[PDB]
């Protein structure tokens, strides 16, 4: 959605971190809970 | 017979039928026979 209203992939223009921060804020409102996109995509189970 | 080429496993070793046949019903690791007994019920509830 964010990328649709924007016209391109947010990452093409901004730092991924800055984008995630927006997604977080949003998603979290949809499920009532501080969510952290980051943690879902780690290198392994041992490395964060 | 090679069921899975080593280059396609995180553990770099071919998956032969001989490496599956002695275990359980003796079916190949990739095509293990499923216990679909409660299948229809899951599908309705919308479980995986």
């Amino acid at each position: 959605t964010l990328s649709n209203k924007l016209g391109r992939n947010p990452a093409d223009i901004f730092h991924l971190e800055e984008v995630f921060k927006v997604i977080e804020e949003i998603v979290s409102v949809l499920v009532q809970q501080k969510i952290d996109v980051r943690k879902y995509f780690t290198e392994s189970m041992r490395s964060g | 017979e090679i069921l899975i080429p080593a280059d396609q496993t995180s553990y770099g070793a071919n998956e032969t039928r001989a490496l599956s046949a002695p275990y359980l019903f003796g079916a190949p690791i990739n095509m293990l026979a499923p216990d679909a007994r409660l299948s229809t019920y899951k599908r309705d509830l919308a479980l995986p």
């Binding site: 290198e43 392994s44 041992r46 490395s47 | 553990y11 770099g12 070793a13």
Partner: protein
């Protein structure tokens, strides 16, 4: 500069002072434990 050992040394000595690298790395222990298993699970005899 290259006519005098002193001169050259002074210039080199200076040129290098400015390099300032800052890298980002995973937790060592994590990687060495992950790769660790990969080895153990697949090696047939203490792999050097």
């Amino acid at each position: 500069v290259y006519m005098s050992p002193l001169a050259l040394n002074n210039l080199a000595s200076r040129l290098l002072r400015k390099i300032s690298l800052h890298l980002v790395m995973q937790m060592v222990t994590a990687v060495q434990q992950d790769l660790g298993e990969v080895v153990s699970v697949s090696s047939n005899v203490t792999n050097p």
